[PDB]
Amino acid sequence: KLHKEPATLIKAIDGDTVKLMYKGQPMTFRLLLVDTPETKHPKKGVEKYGPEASAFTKKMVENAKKIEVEFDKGQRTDKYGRGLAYIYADGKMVNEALVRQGLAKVAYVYKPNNTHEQHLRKSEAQAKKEKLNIWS
Numbered sequence: 014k015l016h017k018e019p020a021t022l023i024k025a026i027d028g029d030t031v032k033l034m035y036k037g038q039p040m041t042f043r044l045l046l047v048d049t050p051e052t053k054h055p056k057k058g059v060e061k062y063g064p065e066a067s068a069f070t071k072k073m074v075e076n077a078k079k080i081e082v083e084f085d086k087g088q089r090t091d092k093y094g095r096g097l098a099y100i101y102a103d104g105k106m107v108n109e110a111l112v113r114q115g116l117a118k119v120a121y122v123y124k125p126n127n128t129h130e131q132h133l134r135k136s137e138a139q140a141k142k143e144k145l146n147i148w149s
């Protein structure tokens with residue numbers, strides 16, 4: 014039932030937040046089902062692998078020919094007004110790429126926005142057994 018829609022990059026903000034032009038309007042998107050280490054919040058400080066996660070997402074979306082957004086089957090925005098989506102760069106899901114590299118954990122799993130949960134958890138398990146980055 015999920016469908017991909019085109020969007021255009023405005024700016025990568027950090028590892029799991031990107032600003033896109035979607036249907037003619039600028040919008041902040043927060044990646045579904047993942048959490049990258051913080052780089053901004055004073056309470057957290059700059060967490061280890063935060064800069065690495067931000068650089069990974071930035072490189073992936075800036076070099077892409079085509080960006081697409083895929084909403085899940087529940088709420089499409091969070092309480093901060095951010096879009097909640099799976100984001101694809103040239104057909105590759107950014108959310109999964111981060112988890113597979115050990116630069117994000119699977120997190121914030123809120124039903125019914127969990128269609129790709131199993132897929133992402135399998136990638137997380139592989140990153141853990143390979144002891145990559147956050148799992149090292």
Ligand SMILES: Cc1cn([C@H]2C[C@H](OP(=O)(O)O)[C@@H](COP(=O)(O)O)O2)c(=O)[nH]c1=O
Pocket residue numbers: 030043044045046047048091092097121123126
């Ligand atoms: C990924 C995601 C985050 N959020 C909210 C939960 C957290 O709220 P609180 O700020 O109150 O803790 C926050 C985590 O986002 P960030 O990781 O960007 O900080 O965004 C959702 O409500 N739904 C979601 O699907």
Ligand SMILES: [Ca+2]
Pocket residue numbers: 029048049050051
């Ligand atoms: Ca985060």
